[PDB]
Amino acid sequence: MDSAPCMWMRGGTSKGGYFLRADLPADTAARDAFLLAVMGSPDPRQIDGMGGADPLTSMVAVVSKSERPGIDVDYLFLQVFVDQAIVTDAQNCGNILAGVGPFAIERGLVAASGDETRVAIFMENTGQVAVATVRTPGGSVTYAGDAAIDGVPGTHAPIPTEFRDTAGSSCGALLPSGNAVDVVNGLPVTLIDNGMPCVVMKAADVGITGYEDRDSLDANAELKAKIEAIRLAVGELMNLGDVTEKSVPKMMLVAPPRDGGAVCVRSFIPHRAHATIGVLGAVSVATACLIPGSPAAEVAVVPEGARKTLSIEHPTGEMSCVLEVDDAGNVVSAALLRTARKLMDGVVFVL
């Protein structure tokens, strides 16, 4: 097959191609080779495909109607590497998730149910369910509205998303090492998975402030080398095997908030600096803020009460994470606002 139907969408602060599962090769080696060609990878410019030469604009959602009881659609996230011939399936992606609901409704996978449509989305990569609510005025998806998210110009229709049962969905526990803190290459880190495996550490401990812009961080070869050494050192401890060629864990460098939020973060995902912050990445970081003795807890400003709005500051503003904690202080849910937009709909081609 040399082409496939495809909707190009912005999902949250990321961008990529949304496919029906049936339209892609069933064999995953052939599927991944096709997706590389669709995107134009490997190429630092992605000039001969639809990737935008940024991992955050080189992403794929494979969506299908679900047979799981109570679930509307199944969603597989695939990261297409920009300049390697690698497609990875080892993580969730809550930004690209934002486009899944609207894509599924437009494609008839799930019926609109009034002016707003709840969509229960099984995230195949980790086996957990997320719930998105999509504006469907008059029974049709809209992308217009009054909502805004930092990192995206303008305003769009809101897409509230809610995540439960996130802890340990990749590493088998919230803290796969069993410790709140671990010393790695002479630095305290928290190894944490509440929907995204993360290594959380103080920006100041790897020799930056945590307030640098994306270009400054991407050009900092010395910083990138130092944190890559830590990432490779903890891959097995987080039950992720050999992470050398994986996209996980995400490296989260935290600092005290500056614009009135809970914490400030710079993320490497795992090699490129994030332009903003990942959705489940932010949930893991926000969760670490609540763990006494974590580097995150030391720099964070944490509100009182069972339902905590934790503003996570990032290079171009912030993204707020509403957590509720149970009896024992465990996070039992996380809710975040996203938006999406259909950008182009048609057929993608490969040679």
Ligand X SMILES: O=C(O)/C=C(\CC(=O)C(=O)O)C(=O)O
Site for ligand X in 255-314 (CB under 6 A): 269, 278-281
Stretch that binds a second copy, among 52-60, 118-126, 204-212, 327-335 (CB under 8 A): 52-60
49 interacts with a second copy by CB under 8 A: yes
**How many residues at the interface with ligand X, by CB under 6 A?**
16
Site for a second copy in 206-225 (CB under 8 A): 215, 219
Site for Cl ion in 19-48 (CB under 5 A): 20-22
Site for Cl ion in 177-216 (CB under 5 A): none
**How many residues at the interface with a second copy, by CB under 8 A?**
41
84 interacts with a second copy by CB under 8 A: no
Query: At closest approach, how far in Å is the CB of 252 from a second copy?
Result: 21
> Which option in Cl ion, a second copy, ligand X, none does residue 196 bind, with CB closer than 5 to 8 A by kind?
ligand X
Residue whose pair of structure tokens reads 């299908």 in the numeric block: 64
Maximum CA extent, the chain:
58
> Which option in Cl ion, a second copy, ligand X, none does residue 43 bind, with CB closer than 5 to 8 A by kind?
a second copy
Between 66 and 95, CB nearer to ligand X: 95
> Which option in a second copy, ligand X, Cl ion, none does residue 21 bind, with CB closer than 5 to 8 A by kind?
Cl ion
Between 95 and 136, CB nearer to ligand X: 95
> Site mask, a second copy, residues 264-293, x = CB under 8 A?
-----------x------------------
Between 102 and 195, CB nearer to a second copy: 102
351 interacts with a second copy by CB under 8 A: yes
Q: What is the dihedral of CA 162, 166, 167, 171, to 10 degrees?
A: -150
Between 21 and 272, CB nearer to Cl ion: 21
Query: At closest approach, how far in Å is the CB of 76 from a second copy?
Result: 21
Site for Cl ion in 90-119 (CB under 5 A): 106
Burial class of residue 22, CB neighbours in 10 A (0-12, 13-18, 19+): exposed
Residues that bind ligand X (CB under 6 A): 13-14, 56, 92-96, 196, 247, 250, 269, 278-281
Residues that bind a second copy (CB under 8 A): 6, 8, 10, 13-15, 40, 42-43, 45-54, 56-57, 143-144, 151-154, 156, 215, 219, 275, 341-349, 351
